[PDB]
Write a protein that binds this ligand. Sequence first.
Ligand SMILES: CCCCCCO[C@@H]1O[C@H](CO)[C@H](O)[C@H](O)[C@H]1O[C@@H]1O[C@@H](C)[C@@H](O)[C@@H](O)[C@@H]1O
Ligand SMILES: CCCCCCO[C@@H]1O[C@H](CO)[C@H](O)[C@H](O)[C@H]1O[C@@H]1O[C@@H](C)[C@@H](O)[C@@H](O)[C@@H]1O
Ligand SMILES: O=c1ccn([C@@H]2O[C@H](COP(=O)(O)OP(=O)(O)O)[C@@H](O)[C@H]2O)c(=O)[nH]1
Ligand SMILES: O=c1ccn([C@@H]2O[C@H](COP(=O)(O)OP(=O)(O)O)[C@@H](O)[C@H]2O)c(=O)[nH]1
Ligand SMILES: [Mn+2]
Ligand SMILES: [Mn+2]
Lengths: 268, 268
Amino acid sequence: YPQPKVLTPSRKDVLVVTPWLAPIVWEGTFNIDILNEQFRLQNTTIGLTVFAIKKYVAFLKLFLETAEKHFMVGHRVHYYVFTDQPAAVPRVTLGTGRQLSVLEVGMRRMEMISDFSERRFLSEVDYLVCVDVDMEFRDHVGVEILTPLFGTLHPSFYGSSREAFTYERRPQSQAYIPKDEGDFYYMGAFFGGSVQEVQRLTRACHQAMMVDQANGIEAVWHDESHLNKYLLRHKPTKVLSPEYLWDQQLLGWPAVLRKLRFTAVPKN
Amino acid sequence: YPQPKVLTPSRKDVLVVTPWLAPIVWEGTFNIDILNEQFRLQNTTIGLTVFAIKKYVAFLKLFLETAEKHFMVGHRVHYYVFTDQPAAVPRVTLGTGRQLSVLEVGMRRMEMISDFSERRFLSEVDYLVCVDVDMEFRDHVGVEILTPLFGTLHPSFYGSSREAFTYERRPQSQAYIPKDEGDFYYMGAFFGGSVQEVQRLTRACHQAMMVDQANGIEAVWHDESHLNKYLLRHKPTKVLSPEYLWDQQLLGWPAVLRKLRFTAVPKN
Ligand SMILES: CCCCCCO[C@@H]1O[C@H](CO)[C@H](O)[C@H](O)[C@H]1O[C@@H]1O[C@@H](C)[C@@H](O)[C@@H](O)[C@@H]1O
Ligand SMILES: CCCCCCO[C@@H]1O[C@H](CO)[C@H](O)[C@H](O)[C@H]1O[C@@H]1O[C@@H](C)[C@@H](O)[C@@H](O)[C@@H]1O
Ligand SMILES: O=c1ccn([C@@H]2O[C@H](COP(=O)(O)OP(=O)(O)O)[C@@H](O)[C@H]2O)c(=O)[nH]1
Ligand SMILES: O=c1ccn([C@@H]2O[C@H](COP(=O)(O)OP(=O)(O)O)[C@@H](O)[C@H]2O)c(=O)[nH]1
Ligand SMILES: [Mn+2]
Ligand SMILES: [Mn+2]
C-alpha cells in the first residue's frame, strides 16, 4: 500500500485528532486495507442495535438493504432489531457471516441496550454500534470506526461554539453541563464501542435518566443530553466526523464532506 | 480548557495520524491538562529503562537530572538503570513519587528488557519506556506518549521514502523488509508501551535475533532492524514525532519542530 507522507497533512481543512489524542474519522485519514486486515486477524464481530417501534418499522427495509451494501462488509455482523412488531420486520437477504435477531419490546433505548448488552449470548460479539433507524447507508461504514468508545459529531453543531451547543443547562439535571465546558456536541443517533464500554455508557445514561425522573426533570434532548454528559466525562477513543451522521436535505453537501456515509431519510 | 476547533487543522505542515488511525504526537496536537487528568485518575506508573555500560555511565548524571525536570513530572516514575558499574550511578535527588533501581548486568538490550519485563516486581508498573542514555531532556516528555505500543520516528529518515530507509534487506534475516513495504523508519533509542506490549516486542526481537545468530547473519542496524520488522507487522498505537528523538548538532532546528524534547548528547 502507499507509504504515509510524514510531511503532508492528511487534511488541511479539518481537525483529525482531538486534544486527548483520539482520531476524528474523516475520509483521507485511514487506509481501509490496513484496518480491514487488523480486524479480520481478530475475527472481529460487530453487533448493530436498531429500534423500530410503531410506524418506524417502515424504515427497516431500506436501512437493512443499505447496511448490507455498506456496513462492515467482509466482517462478521449481527443485527439486533428491537421492535413492537416482529412480523413487520422485512426478510432481507444477508451476505455470508451476517445474522439478524428480532427482540420484541418492551428511557426506552438506553435501558433496553443496557439490559441486552449484559446478556451472555453476546459472548461472541466484540463491538456494539447503536443507531437510529430513520437512516440509510450511502457509502462505506467500516472497521475504521471501531475502538473502545466512540461518539459522532452532530451534523448541525460541528462548526458551533460550545455556548451554542444544546446541552442540558439546568444544574438540577444529571445531564447538566456548564456553559464553559464541553468538547463537542455528539448525536444520539450513532454511538458505540466495545461491549464493555457500551454496557458502561448505557448503564450510566439509564441510571442518570432515572435520577432525573425521580426529580421531575426531563433533560432537554433526552438520552442525547445524557450521552453528551457521559462523553464529556469519559472521553471517546475515536470521534466520527459528520460523514457518519448527515442530513443532506437539511444541510446539503458541504466542501468539508468528501463522503456522505449514513444519512437521514426524510420524515414527518 | 479551550474548545477544540473542528474546522481548524491541528497542523498544516505535518501528518498527525497514521493510515491505521494511530496519533502521531507533535506539539499542538494534544492538551496536556486533559491527558494528565486521565492518567492521574488511573494512578499511572511509568517505568523507564536505560542502559549505561562501560564508558556510557558518564551520561547518567545529565540524563537523570534532566529526566527529573521534564519526564512524566507529576506522575509516578521508576527508573531502572542497567549497568556493569553500580557504584558509578550518580546519586541524583528525585521528586516525590519517583524511584530508581540499579540492575547489574550482565542482543544485550532486548534480551535483558525481555527478562526484566516478565518479573513480578513490575506488578505496580503500567507502562515501560525504553531509551538510550546518551541523551538529555530539554522539554516536556509526558503522558501524551503513553499507549499500548509506540515507536518514534528516526530524525534522519522522517522525510525519506521507504526505499531509502535502512531496513534489513537480506531475505535470510528475520528482520528482512522488502523494498515495497514499510510505513516509517523507527529509532531504536525510544520505544515503549504497556508492560504486556513491551514484553511481547522485546521477546519477539530477542527470539528473532537468536535465529539470525544461529544462521550467521547480523542485521544491518542490529536491534533497530528487528524493532522495525516488529512494528511493521504489529503496528504501533501512537507514533512519536522526531521532537522526541532529535540530534540538534546534526540536524539543526527545522521549521517542522516546535519543540526539541529529548536530544542526543554529542559523543565520539
Ligand atoms: C427541521 C429540523 C431541524 C433540526 C436541526 C437540529 O437537529 C436536531 O438537533 C437536536 C439537538 O439540538 C437533536 O439532536 C435532534 O435529534 C436533531 O434533529 C434531528 O437530526 C437533524 C440532523 C435532522 O435530521 C432532523 O430532521 C432530526 O429530527
Ligand atoms: C555522524 C552520524 C550520522 C548518522 C545519521 C543517521 O543516523 C543513524 O542512523 C542509523 C540507521 O541508518 C542508526 O539508527 C544509527 O543509530 C543512527 O545514528 C545515531 O543517531 C543519529 C540521529 C545521530 O545522533 C548519530 O550520532 C547516532 O550515532
Ligand atoms: O415512534 C418512534 C420514535 C422513535 N423510534 C426510534 O428512536 C429513534 C430516534 O427518533 P427520531 O429518529 O424519531 O429522532 P430524530 O432522529 O428526529 O431526533 C428512531 O430512529 C427509532 O430508532 C421508533 O422506533 N419509533
Ligand atoms: O558502550 C556502550 C555502548 C552502548 N550502550 C547503550 O546502548 C545505547 C545505544 O548506543 P549508542 O547510544 O552507542 O548508539 P547510537 O545511539 O549512536 O546508535 C546507548 O545509549 C547506551 O544506552 C552502553 O551503555 N555502552
Ligand atoms: Mn433519527
Ligand atoms: Mn544513542
